[PDB]
Amino acid sequence: GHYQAEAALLQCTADTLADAVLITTAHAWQHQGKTLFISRKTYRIDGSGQMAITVDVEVASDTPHPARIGLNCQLAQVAERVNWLGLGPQENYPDRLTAACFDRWDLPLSDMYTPYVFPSENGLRCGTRELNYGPHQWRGDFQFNISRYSQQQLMETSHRHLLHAEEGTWLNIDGFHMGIGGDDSWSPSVSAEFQLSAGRYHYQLVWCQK
Amino acid sequence: VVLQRRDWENPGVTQLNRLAAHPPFASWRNSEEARTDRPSQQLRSLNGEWRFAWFPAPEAVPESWLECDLPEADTVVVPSNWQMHGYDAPIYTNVTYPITVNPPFVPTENPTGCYSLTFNVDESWLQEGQTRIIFDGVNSAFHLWCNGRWVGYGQDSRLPSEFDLSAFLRAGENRLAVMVLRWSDGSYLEDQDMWRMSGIFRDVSLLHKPTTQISDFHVATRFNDDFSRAVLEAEVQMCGELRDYLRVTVSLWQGETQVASGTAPFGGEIIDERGGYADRVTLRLNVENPKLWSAEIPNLYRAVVELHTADGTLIEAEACDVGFREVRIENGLLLLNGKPLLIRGVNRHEHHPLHGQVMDEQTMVQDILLMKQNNFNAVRCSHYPNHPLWYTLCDRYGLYVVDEANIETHGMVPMNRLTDDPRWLPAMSERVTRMVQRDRNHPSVIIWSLGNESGHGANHDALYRWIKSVDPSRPVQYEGGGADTTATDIICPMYARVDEDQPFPAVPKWSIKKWLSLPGETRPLILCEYAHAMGNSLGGFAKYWQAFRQYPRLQGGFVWDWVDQSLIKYDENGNPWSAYGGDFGDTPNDRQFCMNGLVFADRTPHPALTEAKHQQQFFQFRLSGQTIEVTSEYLFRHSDNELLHWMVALDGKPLASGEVPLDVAPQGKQLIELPELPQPESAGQLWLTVRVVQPNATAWSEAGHISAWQQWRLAENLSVTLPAASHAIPHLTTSEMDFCIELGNKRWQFNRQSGFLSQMWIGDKKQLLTPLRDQFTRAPLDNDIGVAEATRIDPNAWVERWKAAGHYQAEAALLQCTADTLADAVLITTAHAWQHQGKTLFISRKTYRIDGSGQMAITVDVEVASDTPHPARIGLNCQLAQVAERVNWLGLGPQENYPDRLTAACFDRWDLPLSDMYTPYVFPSENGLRCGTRELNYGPHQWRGDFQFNISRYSQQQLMETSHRHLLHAEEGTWLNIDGFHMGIGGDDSWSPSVSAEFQLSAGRYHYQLVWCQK
Ligand SMILES: [Mg+2]
């Protein structure tokens, strides 16, 4: 039930600090009585206008290791360029990133989408320390993809030509992402060191207008 | 002639008037006594009180000593090493010879032991027959006198020297004089990494044989394809006058039942143009369905060799235990009785902390019992033939033995200088040939070794072929010169790693997996030495066993090594303590490098032993749904003394348990269906633990012995319940130097100058003696120090990289320390940088959130500079004021475990006395860590999270500053080290970086969280 898990709010509190506001949240993702994942976050917004997000996720040890541990949203902005400090310029995944180089990359948005004839998760860049898109800047140590197509549309569309650009831009930012595998394509082929089996995961992001 | 010839500086003279080597003799004059292996009246022990005098050189021995006792001499027990009686110092050196390298010469100051004994010889012994003296071990050379007359000379410290005293003795009182030289030309071949000692350290005895005698015998067992039929073949040699009425009868016994018998006159088959051996006979006995010998089931028969007249007067009988087994290498695999062995081995020196290199039955048996109880099936005699009883015990208890010749020339440059020299072939040949002649009938010996660390010379090739010619029944191995030379049947490297190549010029140590498949390579690979167990070690042990089980031609190895070579010394108060190199005035020396054992010198286990036991298990397990699959790795026996116990617990709390008898054929599988387990209501992880228990006692183990175990995670129910909201709010108080937080009877103090929690109060009683501070260092392990020789400094060693980077002297610099009062909490935020000479090594960012329920949640985020050597640990430490009796934790245990050595540990609720949380390594280091811990309890304190911890009365600082465990003193209170992350310990070897990349702390950014409260 990974694809239909519903979020249940456990905790949502606000605190005032000397120079910031602190929001604390906790969610449980459940499928038919069973808790799959718990996400605990803090959002810290200071006087510089930076929003520091910490995410700590628990993954139930008896649930299949998940494809990713991240955040997503549909931004209103549609911008022409994507600029990042990280591995690139091309699409790269944790078990296929050796060709990719760490540097400052700048590409048109459409280059951040890989037009696989059968649509799937695509266009991830890993080892990214800074990402820029329109007015936004995200900093941390993360994996991301960015495009006009939601994961939902990609998984429901059988051919690339049938994909339609959605309103705004879909952003997926991952603290962690599973290997893609490929030793073969007819059995589990993602090596153990690239499966998300650690049980507890931490990542942190700073979101700001640049 | 004696002082003039100087035979101890001549490699061309290794003996004078010494008798031929042979298998163990007792010259029974009754066949029943031979059969039952009872004492023989013809074999007398001369062990006991002898006369001893020490001299700085042989030239200083008074010529009076030959005929008469010196009253200035003392009464000492024999066998003994004289260093253990205080006469001079034992020397510990590893590679560098303890004498100047000037072959064949030794130092003119050559310590000399003058042994003597006055004893009765009965008349009956001199009227008829031959009386010989047997010195089982004399280190390292000796001249022998009987009643003032010179008998002979012998070298090789580790094999029996025998002399005929028939013409030397008289009825009644006699006197023996033995002049033992510490150093000889034989010392050049005795450069083993051990204490250098001397003396009559093995048994002395007198043997009476009749004139017409069994002078040698060889037992062979050959088999048909399925081992349902055997032929025992016994060649027997005689001395004395040949007569037509003489016969040999070889009879084979199984308990009190005689199974086969052969009788024949002397006269072998034609051998060449000159005939055959008139003085030899070969008996061939048929055995149907022989009970086969193995380490798993050590089935033995008794062979009695009777020399007698045709009409049946017994002249004498000799005997031996016979184990029916075939050892062969076929298609690249080492087979015992047709099945591929998996060697669960260990190297074992002959060492006692009180008696030195003198061995006793009790210590030998203790060693065998502990070995078998910890799933060992093999032993390598590193690096010399052992005390004769060892082989008898390995025959009877069941251990595979590598019997190794007393040859090591490690200190030579290059290592093969003497072994490639034909001038040294005679001395070498005797160390090989006389071992084979002695030990060839012991079924436990399955492999011969040509020695150790002597490079590869032409002499090795010659002696390899000699053994292959003389004894086809056993493979020959030798590691020297690259571990895969023409002198070895088995690729037998020392400390080759599993996945990592070490490409040394001329003598590379390839990854063991890669070595097997090198172009044209076909042999089996069994490491003569691996997993160096020096101090806190055996990290990466599981990696070896995974590889051994996956690759047919990887057939195991011998751990280095069994027992710490530490010696007892006594302090001013007469209290005993363990000493290593340098502690006896011995210099040069190689310090603690003599201690590499799985067990302490008194045979108390190191924590590493349990990891070996677990990895060497003979049952393998898989879980699928409710089904446990048990696979046997026994080759011969069914699991007829085994039951599987299983238990499911929720975070330490038992919920269900049961037991099922195991009925697994060798190499077979058994499926065990677990009953339906009821769901737990509460949150937490279910754990399944299985154990194989032996309901019955064996010769090697007690009833209830656990031989194997395994654990799995079952269902996890993650906690979603909100902790009850408290109506109390913590109160913040501020001063220039402190943030203080008060809640009920609890108080916390944060020093604003340092940025650390400096104090904590429960009922106004102080909980800390030292503030809670980040720690990135450990008191270095022997593996961190990375030294095989005390003269060698390696900039590449972990400790040296840490020191050069300033990890041990980097000091915290405060960047930020703030306090915020929240709705139901006080939030302290801190940030620190550790810097060394301008460079920022680490940054630590923390929050401490103290809420109304009294809990302090600590969140820690650390950055480690990518170009600094990866740190030993990332955690906190403090000195608690409390000393409590017990430590209680939910995590891996009960024993010490580290990230690359935790497979043996199980997750459960453990409760131990505080002293058990400290491992008394003789060289003090970081110790007692327990990993995968979710909850720790000590006095009124509880820490929760996911961490590694150790807890003791000794700080990391004291540990790293103290060279011996006996010099450690309990500090005030208790030092707690709680780690989010801890580096592996390594141990593939102990003289180079050996921590595998996956166990190094290289991630750059680290996160962990702890909740500290009172229960
Ligand atoms: Mg000599």
Ligand SMILES: [Mg+2]
């Ligand atoms: Mg050596």
Ligand code: NA
């Ligand atoms: Na699709």
Ligand code: NA
């Ligand atoms: Na194997």
Ligand code: NA
């Ligand atoms: Na050693």
Ligand code: NA
């Ligand atoms: Na130390």
